[PDB]
Ligand binder design. Structure first.
Ligand code: NI
Ligand code: NI
Ligand code: NI
Ligand code: NI
Ligand code: NI
Ligand code: NI
Lengths: 172, 166, 172, 161, 165, 172
């Protein structure tokens, strides 16, 4: 379907709103972010294989590609907005309406039960933390709280097989 | 309060999402929009005065200033998102938290029963309609989707005609 | 008239030039600026009603909305240019030519002859000083001179009633 | 490695130069582009599957992720530049130096040597064609110039329409 | 002086205001504009020289380089602003205070006192006309008035090529 | 020829890639850069005349104007790309094909052996280093390497006549 392709194209324009609201001047798009979540997911999957941890790599990659696709309809609701609206719920509804196909993949990510869902959750957070560091390098002085995501990572069981990359990142 | 001023400053950075998702390259901010909504309200309140219609202009200007201030917290949710989320309810909740003193003014705007509430509603739509035509002059070919249902439009036929004649 | 509305739309596009020349990447428009001047005017008006000071709020909001509308013709000439050009008088004359009712209001702001005019002058400078702080948070190191406006706030009769918000903003 | 992740981040900032040179004012980044190639690759692989065509979906998705990663080092060289400079050859070397393990995947893509490589080449072209249509909707008037296809006749004609 | 180079760097940021007000989304800077005015001045000067005209190429190039430099202080005054403010006068005063050594060259430009001064004026207009055509290719529909701008007996090949756009 | 002029117009839009890849948010164009290189060349030529060093100013300004014009075709290849591609060779070829009459001028620039070639090489590096300082003022923390080009100037004989400006630049 061309409509689905045009729908994913909205992620090239929809900004990542956390950065924007902080006054980061040319904030990345949701497509920008999702691209690197996929790349990170690929790298972390290979690291998990090295450690003998069984990962369905194909599944993890699909989840990374689709995980923020609901934002093509909902937009990237910032934390401030999430006090008053249920972001994942509206994303899930909108995903169900255009790609029911991938409804179970979003739930995996969203519920973060499966190793594959947790991995993408970790890739998601790593993209964001690393991106905060890069925006500080270009001048942002107000992104310290985007590092509170590391404490969240350790919450996930799979994080115990990724202590070396989590440390590489701490070392920023 | 500097914090409230900072809050209002977020409107300088929050984009108007309709234009952005359509592909308008440097879409206006919510402050840009709210500015001209206040200007249009002032202008139309004077044309109403001439026609012998009574308008509390102070109230109408206050309403225009605050009408999208909730979007500093909520952002400017596009129509696509409004299928899944209640825009106006979320803005009302947010405003009640930070600016409870402007809770009634936002309710006037949303209900659009008073002349002042309806005026700002009309001003809101005119800014958008006129902005679509302006972005079309600079290349947008996909804004065709961007008033008579409001009682007050009968006092404002001339400006509505001028807009339509664009 | 739709021409006046089109004229006001120009403030959405016209940059605030002092930021731009300093290297602030995506500086606010004159409309962004005037929007928050109106907001600040409304806050301070209410603050002055508390203190029992009589302000015509309608008039003060009108002045805030129109105070930079002549820049739609003149543009926002920076300090450097104001050494060679009479900006306030060029604006008054431009405004006279498009809406003579708006010339009187501009003059209240410009010459600070009324309490309402003074209030907008202060709101105008508070927007700017706070905006410099915000642009500092996102990387700007060369904006210290935009705090020199704080001293100018004290020159007006109205500032005797705003010794608080002044201190709030000095603290920054 | 954080270096690789930093390297891939450069794609969020490196512009798709074809559009930029045509005068498109806020051109997509290489990441933006690669995101939608990955999405299109997925969608099309599932259409191939519906038809009973064998395809390693995992491999195709990996290739889509990495297929423009060399551009994080080389940048996205426009056509005008490719008359003087060998873009694929430069991207292949750059990639080898950072991700030697994906050298053969890149080769499958760049020389369209497998069904998976072909699929990503197709998704890659479809993103650019559809993006040119999108930039025409927002104002561009100068974008007209912008085997496994036997299984993809439906989507190819949806695009033509 | 580093202050002079910082002064010239302001032109990389100061936008060409006519396009901006028209709604052209990422308008060229004054430096972008001056760069191509200098390039066109070089082309035009070499065309005159080949056709047998006595032309000081070095001078015309210096003039092209400095001709909008007063806009580092004054900014790029649009037509609307010029009904109320004297632009060239303001530019001349500002140049006088920072680059007094280029006052006489700016005068050649501003008053078209020399052939080299005139040539830069011609390059200046050509840049603008051709840039309107470029911004129309990318979507602008409201730039017709910027084609109104269209020795020239030695420049008829180029002026006809521009007309043909 | 309108084609030549359209070609030079490409420099208005082509970014200086070094900045962009660093995260500088609205980086200068090649034309922005090339403008100030021409400016600095003029300025330095005049400083050299005061020190008794004759320069062919006409030639030096032509060189400054054409020196990055091949980037209209090739783009501004960053250092990362230069490890795999011959930038200078590809620009010379592109120039030869469009402006064969300025081939020797771009040779002088690229070799930087003649007085005029050295002069424009100095101006080019000075524009870059000073631009790096300007971008740091607006928030970049990751541009220190660009100052290493100061070291490359001493290797050009003519810089012994330009010690006062080179010291001002170091003083930033
Ligand atoms: Ni995400
Ligand atoms: Ni509104
Ligand atoms: Ni103001
Ligand atoms: Ni590609
Ligand atoms: Ni000029
Ligand atoms: Ni250069």
């Amino acid at each position: 379907s061309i409509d689905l392709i045009l729908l994913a194209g909205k992620l090239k324009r929809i900004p990542r709103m956390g950065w924007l609201i902080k006054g980061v001047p040319n904030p990345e798009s949701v497509a920008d972010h999702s691209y690197r979540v996929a790349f990170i997911t690929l790298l972390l999957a290979e690291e998990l294989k090295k450690k003998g941890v069984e990962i369905d790599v194909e599944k993890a990659l699909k989840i990374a590609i689709i995980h923020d696709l609901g934002e093509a309809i909902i937009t990237d609701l910032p934390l401030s907005a999430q006090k008053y609206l249920n972001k994942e719920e509206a994303e899930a509804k909108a995903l169900k309406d255009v790609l029911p196909e991938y409804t179970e993949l979003f739930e995996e990510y969203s519920k973060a039960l499966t190793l594959e869902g947790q991995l993408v959750k970790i890739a998601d957070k790593l993209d964001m933390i690393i991106q905060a560091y890069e925006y500080e390098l270009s001048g942002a002085k107000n992104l310290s709280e985007f590092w509170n995501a590391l404490e969240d990572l350790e919450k996930l069981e799979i994080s115990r097989y990724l202590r070396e990359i989590i440390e590489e990142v701490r070392r920023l």
